[PDB]
Ligand binder design. Structure first.
Ligand SMILES: O=S(=O)(c1cccs1)N(Cc1ccc(F)cc1)Cc1ncn[nH]1
Ligand SMILES: [Mn+2]
Ligand SMILES: [Mn+2]
Length: 360
């Protein structure tokens, strides 16, 4: 009925009749706040409500994380503590409710897609800049939302720059808005910031090959990309679409490349059923189909299901194009990267920043 400290009560039990809190509602940028639109919006109320339940789990998990995340903890300890909480609040139930993708805790010049695999001894340090990026879902309605953790105030202005650029992207987004215009607007704001870190000055660079993305049911990246620099596609955002608006700022080259051991994997959404006779590969694909479907997973999540010595079977599925690997994405050695991300609903009546909290 009432949430505990530490959080343990599922969000569904905190609401009496399955009506979850709305996120931040915004008027679209320059007639909708329309009977045709109001009815069209109401027709998807069950869907918006699923996003809101997942968003409330995301808000409660991240507030709890911020209370205890500290240097000295291992990255595994952080991810396990966060994920244990997330499973409880979302009331994990197979593909009906659960974790939408692994917990990113990328450090320093690593901007995204790093989560420890078994045996990783990495310890969070006082000077680290850590991007906590995790997702929850109800019925495949995904919340993709992220923030940056630091302990040293030297990164405060870099975080402020990226947060403002993400908020600028969110404000610019709308029905019939050109994706390229969102990218231009984000870049102008991010580049308006100069920061000083350890006696060196930088003009914050958007990471040009990182992007926001449309979201589909059980589909983290549905096909449209939201650039964070100028020169993109004039393709428009459409009514009823859902987007992850994320921005990344860097003190390095402002470009990422694959680096480090891969931890994130996801079945290719478009690949059809593929009969497998190789026993270990067949078993692993069945495990993936049963537990994740088209949602992303990580090696730790296969380990927890009691799977072991599966790396060759996993490589086989990647080589067949059934599963895609998503390795960590890093800028140059010595650079600092920061990220903020929210999920927005392009509802017929308004734009809802469904994952907005009192934090960011
Ligand atoms: O970089 S992405 O592949 C992408 C961005 C634009 C078009 S495709 N990607 C989606 C994703 C892919 C695999 C995962 F296991 C989890 C997520 C961004 C992202 N990661 C975390 N939050 N957001
Ligand atoms: Mn994310
Ligand atoms: Mn994303």
């Amino acid at each position: 009925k009432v949430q505990t400290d530490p959080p343990s009560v599922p969000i569904c039990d905190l609401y009496p009749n399955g009506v979850f809190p709305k996120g931040q509602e915004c008027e679209y940028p320059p007639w909708r706040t329309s009977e045709e639109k109001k009815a069209l919006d109401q027709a998807s109320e069950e869907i918006w409500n699923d996003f809101r339940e997942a968003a409330e789990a995301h808000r409660q998990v991240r507030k709890y994380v911020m209370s205890w995340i500290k240097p000295g903890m291992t990255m595994i300890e952080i991810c396990e503590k966060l994920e244990d909480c997330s499973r409880k609040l979302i009331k994990e139930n197979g593909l009906n409710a659960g974790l939408a993708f692994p917990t990113g805790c990328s450090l320093n010049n690593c901007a995204a897609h790093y989560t420890p695999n078994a045996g990783d001894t990495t310890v969070l340090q006082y000077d680290d800049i850590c991007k906590i990026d995790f997702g929850t879902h109800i019925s495949g309605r995904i919340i993709d939302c992220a923030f940056t953790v630091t302990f040293n105030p030297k990164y405060d202005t870099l975080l402020k720059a990226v947060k403002d650029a993400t908020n600028t992207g969110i404000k610019c987004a709308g029905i019939d808005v050109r994706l390229c215009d969102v990218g231009e607007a984000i870049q102008e704001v991010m580049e308006s910031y100069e920061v000083e870190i350890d006696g060196k000055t930088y003009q914050v660079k958007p990471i040009r090959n990182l992007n926001g993305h449309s979201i589909g049911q059980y589909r983290i990246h549905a096909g449209k990309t939201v650039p964070i620099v100028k020169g993109g596609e004039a393709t428009r955002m459409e009514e009823g679409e859902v987007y992850a608006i994320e921005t990344f700022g860097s003190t390095g080259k402002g470009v990422v490349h694959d680096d480090m051991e891969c931890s994130h994997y996801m079945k290719n959404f478009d690949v059809g059923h593929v009969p497998i006779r190789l026993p270990r590969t067949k078993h692993l694909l069945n495990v993936i189909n049963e537990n994740f479907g088209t949602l992303a997973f990580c090696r730790r999540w296969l380990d927890r299901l009691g799977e072991s010595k599966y790396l060759m079977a996993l490589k086989n599925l990647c080589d067949l194009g059934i599963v895609d690997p998503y390795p960590p994405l890093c800028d140059i050695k010595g650079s600092y990267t920061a990220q903020f991300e929210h999920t927005i609903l392009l509802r017929p009546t308004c734009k809802e920043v469904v994952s907005r909290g009192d934090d960011y």
